[PDB]
Design a protein around this ligand. Structure first.
Ligand SMILES: [Cl-]
Ligand SMILES: [Cl-]
Length: 118
């Protein structure tokens, strides 16, 4: 069981972290956490940094990388294929808070730091 206090704690820890690279934060919720699901990235961040992002990008957690399809189309960036599997293989669940930062690499790499509830 996840308590309300744990949720508040994890969100506060995530909010304290301020990467030097461009970043956004997202609290994982159930509609993002099942096989075949999608997840839209924040629209402002997507417009500023992810125009022309296409195809399988690298999502990195603890120096391991997962392929996640990220398509920017009709004004929104959407994760699809590979996103759920990234969360499952990293034992991420609802309430965990992920900070995604855009690394200074040739291709698109989003590095995740997870602030886990339990
Ligand atoms: Cl919440
Ligand atoms: Cl694509």
């Amino acid at each position: 069981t996840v308590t309300a206090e744990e949720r508040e704690r994890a969100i506060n820890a995530a909010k304290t972290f301020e990467p030097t690279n461009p970043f956004f934060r997202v609290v994982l919720r159930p509609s993002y956490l099942y096989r075949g699901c999608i997840m839209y990235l924040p629209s402002g961040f997507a417009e500023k940094y992810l125009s022309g992002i296409s195809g399988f990008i690298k999502v990195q957690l603890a120096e391991k990388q997962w392929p996640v399809r990220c398509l920017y189309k009709a004004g929104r960036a959407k994760f699809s294929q590979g996103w759920y599997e990234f969360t499952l293989e990293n034992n991420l669940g609802e309430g965990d808070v992920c900070v995604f930062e855009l690394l200074r690499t040739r291709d698109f790499v989003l590095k995740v730091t997870a602030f886990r509830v339990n």
